Structures are given as structure tokens and as C-alpha cells.
Design a protein around this nucleic acid. Structure first.
Length: 87
DNA sequence: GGCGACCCGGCGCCCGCTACGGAGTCAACTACGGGTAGGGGGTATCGGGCAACGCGGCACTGAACACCGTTGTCATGTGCCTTG
């Protein structure tokens, strides 16, 4: 069957979740939060940049600028060795 | 007319696992009518990229004072020489 949850894949996904969440915890609180909402780690629906700029109280271009800032920071080789292997 | 065999159905099972071949199938027709489903066409709505402002760290503004620190300064005290 195809509907079976392969234990190896499920456990790898859980480990990826934990490692990624730790990596965001390395980032600043606001930066980690905004990138999380932009990619919906907390909830299955990611929020657009303007969509993030309502609960947090930032403007769509301001939140956009920090989204660019988050993507850069997670792109430095520091917080990249761990997540390269998980793909 | 309940016993009785007998008859019959009817059923029930028939050690363990791995490991180990392939495969794949004979007989209507057309007309309509709708409804949906897709196609492009065009349109309101949401999202991403630049100019003006605000900060914020520090930095300069040294300017204006302060902190030691220094050789200015000195009227006023020991030591030798001359005279009582």
C-alpha cells in the first residue's frame, strides 16, 4: 500500500521539525516568529507578508524587509550545515 | 407410532514457516436533448519594488571644564664672615 506511514520517513520528518525549530530559536524572537508565519511552521497556512503585518503591527514593506533579512540569516553557512542533509 | 436402522445430508477438520513459475479471455443501433466542461476575454483585487521620513550608535563638536602634575614663585629661614 501507499497510505502506510513509513516509520523512517515519519521519524526523519519529526527530526527535521525539531532541528528547524531549534534553528529558528537560534534567530531573534521577532525574526524567527515572522519567518515562521511566512512559512507557517506553527499553522499549516503560511501568511503573506502583508498578512503578517496585522497581528505583529508592522507594514507590508517593513515585514517584507525583515523576511528578506530572515532568509539571508538562515542562508549563512552557520545555520546551513544541519539543514542541508535533511533536504 | 415410537423405535429402529439406515439413510442421508451436512458438516468439520485435514503439521510449520520461509521461498518459489507464468499469466489476463467469443455474440445492436441511432437519434435526440440536455448539461457540463472547457476555452479565452476581460476585470477587480492582492503582492512585490522604490522614494520620502524617522531613529540609534556613535561620533564629532571639542568646548568647557576638571584631574593630576609640574617648575613657576617666593618672603623667609640656616651658615659663614665681620665687628662689637
Amino acid at each position: 500500500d501507499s497510505e502506510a506511514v513509513v516509520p523512517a520517513d515519519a521519524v526523519s520528518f519529526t527530526l527535521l521539525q525539531e532541528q528547524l525549530h531549534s534553528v529558528l530559536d537560534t534567530l531573534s524572537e521577532r525574526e524567527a516568529g515572522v519567518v515562521s508565519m511566512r512559512f507557517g511552521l506553527t499553522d499549516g497556512q503560511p501568511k503573506t507578508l502583508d498578512e503578517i503585518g496585522k497581528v505583529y503591527g508592522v507594514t507590508r514593506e517593513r515585514i517584507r524587509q525583515i523576511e528578506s533579512k530572515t532568509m539571508s540569516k538562515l542562508r549563512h553557512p552557520s545555520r546551513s550545515q544541519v539543514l542541508r542533509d535533511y533536504l
